[PDB]
Amino acid sequence: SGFRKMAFPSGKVEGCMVQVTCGTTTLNGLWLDDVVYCPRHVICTSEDMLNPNYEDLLIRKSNHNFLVQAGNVQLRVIGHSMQNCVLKLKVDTANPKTPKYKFVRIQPGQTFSVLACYNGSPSGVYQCAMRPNFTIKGSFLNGSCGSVGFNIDYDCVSFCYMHHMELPTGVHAGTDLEGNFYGPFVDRQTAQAAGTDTTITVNVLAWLYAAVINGDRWFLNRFTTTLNDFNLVAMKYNYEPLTQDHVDILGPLSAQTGIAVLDMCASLKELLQNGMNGRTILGGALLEDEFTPFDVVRQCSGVTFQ
Amino acid sequence: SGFRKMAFPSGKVEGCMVQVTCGTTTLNGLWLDDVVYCPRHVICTSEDMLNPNYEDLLIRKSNHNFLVQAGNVQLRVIGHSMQNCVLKLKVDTANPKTPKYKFVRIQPGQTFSVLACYNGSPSGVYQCAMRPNFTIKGSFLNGSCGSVGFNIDYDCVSFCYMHHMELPTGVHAGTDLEGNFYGPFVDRQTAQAAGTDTTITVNVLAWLYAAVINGDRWFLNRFTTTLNDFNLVAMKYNYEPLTQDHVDILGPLSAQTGIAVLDMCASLKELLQNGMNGRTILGGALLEDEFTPFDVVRQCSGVTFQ
């Protein structure tokens, strides 16, 4: 038993983290096959980040201006290109530790594991979630740009996020592995407003189901609610509107615990209206929203990707 | 910026996780060099766990009764021995992915990363802490026995924990890699009382320093306290007594933020006596105690073990 915020094993990703140097700036790159992916603001300086003309800046750079170090190996760049906000540095040799991988663009509310790196070396791994405003609340210091988020499917690594910048409000923004930013963010040092953030309601319900599986049950009320009447309360507390697609997602969790989805929504409503009253759920005093229903089923059944 | 509960990269540990089968029971083993370490209750059944005579049970077993699978490789056991509560299965070939490693016995309050495994395959990684009562609050299902906790020091892996059993109260107990249990626990299915758990005070202060580094500052009071007068309040709220060794541990954190250790203790005292008043610290409403002062300095400076 027990429930933990759990990250994917990072072995298959560690072997792909390299160091990318261009001029004075260093950040992390992703070495898959014979291509190194890294944020395009590695060709910038601190003053360039204000109003960067990335096309004119990259034209100044040639093939031998990019220093790619893989642990103690250094790769020979035999081609470079700019795909949106990511740089594709064609290298000499293919990464022998290249895992089976895909590039995926996730949706708000989905979760993934982040391998925090500095100078191409993995520092740590933690789980996070794409906020509904396309930001993430991670831990990224200077030199952590290019750190990647991923999911594991048995043997296949689904790369979904690349860290690019810290917003002035302390939150983090990034792109997919095709260089397209999540949200309305641009790789430019300016005031960038992230929209109003809401709580992923379907994630909160999955985390309540996980609490029932583990014994914590004081929040199970004797009332119910409808889908509409719950959404009226959800809008008041900045919660995502629950759709029928979300209710069907919680089907398996509903089947295992014998508690209907609408019955758990009334428990959440009373948690929103009345609070927790000094009690805890799975050792916490806030409603956790960083576990998808697939995350809960994974930890509760013991899925082994190896 | 940002602060996350962060686990060590698990690459060096994944390559050492094997499957150990003896009779009907399966659990995870640790393959370092030519020795496989696994809990000794792999030679038991469900009824054996009541009153197990491990010496008489192991004597019934011979060398070819242990089925060790490493991914798709299966190893040839050429020797077996019982060191306390751990089994040492001498195998034919040495693990080619054996990292530089030590066996360490940690102290209560120290933290480590757990690689949750099932049938010898890594499921996920998360950070935890040795509670003052020598238990851990992890996520261990059936078949997760033999999962190991570890710390990374640059290139060296310090193995410190091996999971053995779930206590009836839902908490977890285990041994070091020499087979010696943490706490008064025995590998026997019975009622085993874990002592009163307290909060690691030195960890809470380190987590408050991390909050100051990240901007959250509303708890910084205009009062102070002495070491004794704080310990009187700490005993009332089930907090570990703060010693001079703990104050010196927080020295670097005190030097970076310009806040004396005793000044932060008065802030914690008012947090204990007055609560949080609906506010949050680093996105949480409870006083986190699973970050050692070394953990905070690590995440704040960007230490890369690779």
A300 is catalytic: no
| A23 torsion bin: left (phi>0), alpha (psi -120 to 50), beta (else) | left
List C-alpha distances in Å: B106 to A74, B160, B192, B249.
Answer: 38, 6, 22, 16
3-state secondary structure chain A: CCCCCCECCCHHHHCCEEEEEECCEEEEEEEECCEEEEEHHHHCCCCCCCCCCHHHHHHHCCHHHEEEEECCEEECEEEEEEECCEEEEEECCCCCCCCEEEECCCCCCCEEEEEEEECCEEEEEEEEECCCCCCECCCCCCCCCCCEEEEEECCEEEEEEEEEEECCCCCEEEECCCCCECCCCCCCCCCCCCCCCCECHHHHHHHHHHHHHCCCCCCCCCCCCCHHHHHHHHHHCCECCCCHHHHHHCHHHHHHHCCCHHHHHHHHHHHHHHCCCCCCECCECCCCCCCCHHHHHHHHHCCCCC
Flag if B9 and A284 touch (Cβ within 8 Å): no
Q: Confirm if B210 and B204 have CB atoms less than 8 A apart.
A: no
| Chain A from 72 to 111: CB within 8 A of any B CB | none
This structure was determined by: X-ray
Q: What is the distance between the alpha carbons of residues B213 and A215, in angstroms, rounded to a whole number?
A: 37
Q: What is the distance between the alpha carbons of residues B138 and B290, in angstroms, rounded to a whole number?
A: 12
A13 to chain B, closest Cα gap in Å? 8
Backbone angles phi, psi at B108, to 5 degrees: -55, 140
Q: What is the distance between the alpha carbons of residues B168 and B166, in angstroms, rounded to a whole number?
A: 7
Q: What is the enclosing helix (H) or strand (E) of B122?
A: strand B121-129
Q: If we measure between CA atoms, which residue out of B23, B53, B18 comes closest to residue B37? A: B18
Flag if A170 and B4 touch (Cβ within 8 Å): no
Tell me whether residue B99 is exposed, middle or buried, using C-beta atoms within 10 angstroms of its C-beta: 0 to 12, 13 to 18, 19 or more: middle
Flag if B122 and A5 touch (Cβ within 8 Å): no
The top-level CATH class assigned to A201-301 is mainly alpha
**Residue B11 sits at the chain A interface (C-beta within 8 Å):** yes
Total residue length of chain A: 306
Q: What is the helix, strand, coil percentage profile of chain B, to 5? A: 25, 30, 45
Q: If we measure between CA atoms, which residue out of A168, A179, A150 comes closest to residue A40? A: A179
A128 is catalytic: no
Chain A residues whose CB is inside 8 A of the B167 CB are none
Q: How many helices (H) and strands (E) does chain B have?
A: 8, 13
Tell me whether residue A65 is exposed, middle or buried, using C-beta atoms within 10 angstroms of its C-beta: 0 to 12, 13 to 18, 19 or more: middle
Q: Confirm if A91 and A147 have CB atoms less than 8 A apart.
A: no
**Residue B4 sits at the chain A interface (C-beta within 8 Å):** yes
Which of A123, A128, A145, A305 to mutate against chain B (most B CBs within 10 Å)? A123
B291 to chain A, closest Cα gap in Å? 14
List C-alpha distances in Å: B200 to A78, B119, B130, B239.
Answer: 54, 34, 10, 6
Instruction: Specify which residues B163 forms β-bridges with.
Output: B174
Residue type, A81: S
Tell the residue number behind the tokens 């072997």, with chain if given.
A15
Rounded to the nearest 10 degrees, the angle between the axes of helix B201-213 and helix B261-274 is: 100
Q: What is the distance between the alpha carbons of residues A202 and B131, in angstroms, rounded to a whole number?
A: 32
Residue type, A14: E
Q: What is the distance between the alpha carbons of residues B122 and B113, in angstroms, rounded to a whole number?
A: 13
Where chain B is discontinuous (C–N > 2.5 Å), the residues before each break are: none
List C-alpha distances in Å: B151 to A104, B157, B171.
Answer: 32, 6, 21
Residue A66, CB-side half-sphere exposure with 13 Å CA sphere: 36
Tell me whether residue B188 is exposed, middle or buried, using C-beta atoms within 10 angstroms of its C-beta: 0 to 12, 13 to 18, 19 or more: middle
Q: What is the enclosing helix (H) or strand (E) of B125?
A: strand B121-129
Q: What is the distance between the alpha carbons of residues B13 and B1, in angstroms, rounded to a whole number?
A: 28
Handedness of CA A253, A3, A281, A152 (dihedral sign): negative
Tell the residue number behind the tokens 């930890």, with chain if given.
A299
Resolution at which this structure was determined, Å: 2.3
CA B59, B174, A280 angle in degrees (round to 5)? 145
Q: At B13, list the tokens.
A: 């540990």
Residue A276, CB-side half-sphere exposure with 13 Å CA sphere: 15
Q: Which residues contact B175 (CB under 8 A, 6 or more apart)?
A: B39, B84, B85, B86, B161, B162, B164, B181, B182
Q: If we measure between CA atoms, which residue out of A52, A18, A49 comes closest to residue A36? A: A18
3-state secondary structure B229-296: HHHHHHHHCCECCCCHHHHHHCHHHHHHHCCCHHHHHHHHHHHHHHCCCCCCECCECCCCCCCCHHHH
Alpha carbon A288 to chain centroid distance?
16
Q: What is the distance between the alpha carbons of residues A12 and B118, in angstroms, rounded to a whole number?
A: 18
Q: Confirm if B288 and B295 have CB atoms less than 8 A apart.
A: no
Q: What is the distance between the alpha carbons of residues A42 and A44, in angstroms, rounded to a whole number?
A: 5
Q: Which residues contact B190 (CB under 8 A, 6 or more apart)?
A: B50
